[PDB]
């Protein structure tokens, strides 16, 4: 019925008044707010803004609600156009969601005036100067703990113990290890007793890492204060102190997000390598088993060669000695480069997204 | 109030006169300059130019000042449109900055009529024919200096000196080295005494390189004209004569710019390699230490294998001998290809930018 002709700098937009008033909380949806720009001389709402953006601004009313930025309008110009037309904050949220920007505030800081002071001081390194100092202290303790874990294995440092087992505070490594574990437990208990909600603390992967980085020390201490397999499993598990370096590194966080996103592609990479390894190890075992000098004793033994030829490591311990085995080894290296080159670009695209999104 | 209707070949642009006269130094901002195209018969400024470009040209007035080239208009056409509408030279500078072109003239040539003649002759190889000759002479001296540095180490050339230390101008290598150092010092002192400002000379990396390429010779000469550690450090530092080849090579300059730009990505690459090396060396030490034939004596010793498996060099000196060690070595080569493949595309994008920008 009623026809409203908008004029965005000479460009007429004749639309039905019903669609214009579908959203009555905007600049055009309020008749007493859009009367400022109305021109009674020509019976049109003359604006003096960007011309291409108003097409999307009008499609917002003509589609109920939908904000799709035209590909020929820059982000800032379109955002300013949304702000001028006062489409709303839900409009801005939909626009940012469509573009790719993600809006997540959360961060429920405690309001007890002391359960938030220490929480800020520890969780947020940039909240203070002492907070940055605490972050630096944590990084230093993590690095020396890694150094201790690696140095404990050097044969030189184990001289009086380098005798057969059949013929703890004095050990210099145990002192540094227990200081590192004390600091880890301290920064864990402070964060747990200063977190807003215990549900989020027991769910964050960056806190499960800190738990796993403390568990082996206490298992070993309890066992000492009185099986072999669990002991070696635990001594290997102790390596997860390098992953609590990810709280202080935005590169490791991006890497973790990339690996979580590219789970299907990592699985495809492993599956393709498994298929190729079985195929080429069978081919090179049967192509080389009649030569009395071959060192493939079985298809399971030719898997190691096939993985080092497909990955193009090629150590050279296991190689073919026959013409047919060398033909097979020639296609393993080429078919390995393709198998690997296929999903890795998808993983790299995920990394670039999470990296430049930062 | 006053309404001006522009007509870019049938396409009306009705804008407020105030926005049109916001910039009074342009073709449309001068009423006595835009009267040429005015059409009193239809009360419109009829132009006969490209239609899509005038949208951006009018947004320049409607946004105070801003030049954003429409994505559907070519660079040359839009530049010609800016030139026709006489928006100004600051408008052209903003346009080039938005596109990506960088404007840097500088080059403060001396005006002493002789402190610039030699400066041109040396700094700019294309200013003359003798300048090109000087550039060629510099490249030749650099190449023979590199050749001398490499040849001095050959065991064959050291025959009468190949006796234990316990049982200088005669040496043929010292003569060529001192001639090269004389030319390096000459081309450095001429450039320093012919530069416009001494502040820029003592700040350019391409001059710090020339200083470092001369320092070891004079340190050695002073020490000879009378410690061991600094002597070997200096003998290694002498290798930085290859980097003064970067003045004469635009590929090395692009490489240096790429490496300065991709500093965070180089750091991430090193950090990811360090994380993976520690992880897989711990895994392969603990997965293989119970085999009496293993050659990983410690986690620090399995780092070398992990770096050569992750980088897929795979020399083959250190390899796994156990089933678990071979499973671990299989994931080191795959997780190394991902770790490396992640930031290298960012570095390559930087190189392509700095390379095609040339």
């Amino acid at each position, epitope marked *: 019925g009623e026809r409203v002709v908008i004029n965005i700098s000479g460009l007429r937009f004749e639309t039905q008044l019903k669609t214009l008033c579908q959203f009555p909380e905007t600049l055009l949806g309020d008749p007493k707010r859009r009367m400022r720009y109305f021109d009674p001389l020509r019976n049109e709402y003359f604006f003096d803004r960007n011309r291409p953006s108003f097409d999307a601004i009008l499609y917002y009313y003509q589609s109920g609600g939908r904000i799709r930025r035209p590909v020929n309008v820059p982000i800032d110009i379109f955002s300013e156009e949304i702000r001028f037309y006062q489409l709303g904050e839900e409009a801005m949220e939909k626009f940012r969601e469509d573009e790719g920007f993600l809006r997540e505030e959360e961060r429920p800081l405690p309001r007890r005036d002391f359960q938030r002071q220490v929480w800020l001081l520890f969780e947020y390194p940039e909240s203070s100067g002492p907070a940055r100092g605490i972050a630096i202290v944590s990084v230093l303790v993590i690095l020396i703990s890694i150094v201790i874990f690696c140095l404990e294995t050097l044969p030189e440092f184990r001289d009086e113990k380098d005798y*057969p087992a059949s013929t703890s505070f004095s050990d210099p490594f145990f002192v540094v290890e227990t200081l590192c574990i004390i600091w880890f437990s301290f920064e864990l208990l402070v964060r747990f007793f200063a977190c807003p909600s215990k549900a989020t603390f027991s769910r964050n992967i960056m806190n499960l890492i800190d738990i796993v980085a403390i568990i082996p020390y206490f298992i070993t201490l309890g066992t000492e204060l009185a099986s072999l397999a669990i002991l070696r499993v635990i001594r290997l598990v102790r390596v997860f102190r390098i992953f609590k370096l990810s709280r202080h590194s935005k590169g490791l966080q991006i890497l973790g997000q990339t690996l979580k996103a590219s789970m299907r592609e990592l699985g495809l990479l492993i599956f393709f390598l498994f298929i190729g390894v079985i195929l080429f190890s069978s081919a090179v075992y049967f192509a080389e088993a009649d030569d009395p000098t071959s060192h493939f004793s079985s298809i399971p033994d030719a898997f190691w060669w096939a993985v080092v030829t497909m990955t193009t490591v090629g150590y050279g311990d296991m190689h073919p000695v026959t013409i047919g085995g060398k033909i097979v080894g020639s296609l393993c290296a080429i078919a390995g480069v393709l198998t690997i080159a296929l999903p890795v670009p998808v993983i790299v695209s995920n990394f670039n997204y999470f990296y430049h999104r930062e | 109030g006053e309404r001006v209707v522009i007509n870019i070949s049938g396409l009306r642009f009705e804008t407020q006169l105030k926005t049109l006269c916001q910039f009074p130094e342009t073709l449309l901002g001068d009423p006595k300059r835009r009267m040429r195209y005015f059409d009193p018969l239809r009360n419109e400024y009829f132009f006969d130019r490209n239609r899509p470009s005038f949208d951006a040209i009018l947004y320049y007035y409607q946004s105070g000042g801003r030049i954003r080239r429409p994505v559907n208009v070519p660079i040359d056409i839009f530049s010609e449109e800016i030139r026709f509408y006489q928006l100004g030279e600051e408008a052209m500078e903003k346009f080039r900055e938005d596109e990506g072109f960088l404007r840097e003239e500088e080059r403060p040539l001396p005006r002493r009529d002789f402190q610039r003649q030699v400066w041109l002759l040396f700094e700019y190889p294309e200013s003359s024919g003798p300048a090109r000759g000087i550039a060629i002479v510099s490249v030749l001296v650099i190449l023979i200096s590199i050749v001398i540095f490499c040849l001095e180490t050959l065991p064959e050339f050291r025959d009468e000196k190949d006796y234990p230390a316990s049982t200088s101008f005669s040496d043929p290598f010292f003569v060529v080295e001192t001639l090269c150092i004389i030319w390096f010092s000459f081309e450095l002192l001429v450039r320093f005494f012919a530069c416009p400002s001494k502040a820029t000379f003592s700040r350019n990396i391409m001059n710090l390189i020339d200083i470092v390429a001369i320092i070891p010779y004079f340190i050695t000469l002073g020490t000879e004209l009378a410690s061991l550690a600094i002597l070997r450090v200096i003998r290694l530092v002498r290798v930085f004569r290859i980097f003064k080849l970067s003045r004469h090579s635009k590929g090395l300059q692009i490489l240096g710019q790429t490496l300065k730009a991709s500093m965070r990505e180089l750091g991430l690459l090193i950090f990811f390699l360090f994380i993976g090396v520690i992880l897989f060396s711990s895994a392969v030490y603990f997965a293989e230490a119970d085999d009496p034939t293993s*050659h990983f004596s410690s986690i620090p010793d399995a780092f070398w294998w992990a770096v050569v498996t992750m980088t897929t060099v795979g020399y083959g000196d250190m390899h796994p001998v156990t089933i678990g060690g071979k499973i671990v070595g299989s994931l080191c080569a795959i997780a190394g290809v991902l770790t490396i493949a992640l930031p290298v595309p960012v570095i390559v994008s930087n190189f392509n930018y700095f390379y095609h920008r040339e």
Partner: nanobody, 115 residues
Framework: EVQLVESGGGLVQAGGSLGLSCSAS????????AGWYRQAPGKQREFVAR???????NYADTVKGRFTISRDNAKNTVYLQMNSLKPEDTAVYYC??????????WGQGTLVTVS
């Protein structure tokens, strides 16, 4: 599995010389600590010598100077040159190769009876 066979018998009297040898199968001596242990009848194990991986040779407090220990790293054998033999050192000299915290391997033993 792994066996550290030894060949060090004989009945050399006081004085003279005798060289015991220890050979390994499935174990590389260049990659493990090695050391001879003795055990006289009616007594317990007595440390004699040890050559760590890296040649940190250290003998006991009694047989120093008069004994020496060596390794090949190519023939995969660990030796023991018994010089200045005395009737005091009559025992069944064993051979042991080990890795600290992972495994220890012994030999059935060889008999050196000094008259």
């Amino acid at each position: 599995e792994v066996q550290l066979v030894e060949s060090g018998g004989g009945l050399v009297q006081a004085g003279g010389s005798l060289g015991l040898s220890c050979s390994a199968s499935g174990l590389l001596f260049s990659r493990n600590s090695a050391g001879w242990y003795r055990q006289a009848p009616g007594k317990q194990r007595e440390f004699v010598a040890r050559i760590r991986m890296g040649g940190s040779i250290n003998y006991a407090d009694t047989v120093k100077g008069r004994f020496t220990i060596s390794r090949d790293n190519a023939k995969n054998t660990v030796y023991l040159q018994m010089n200045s033999l005395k009737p005091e050192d009559t025992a069944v000299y064993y051979c042991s190769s080990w890795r600290t915290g992972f495994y220890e391997y012994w030999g059935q033993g060889t008999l050196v009876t000094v008259s």
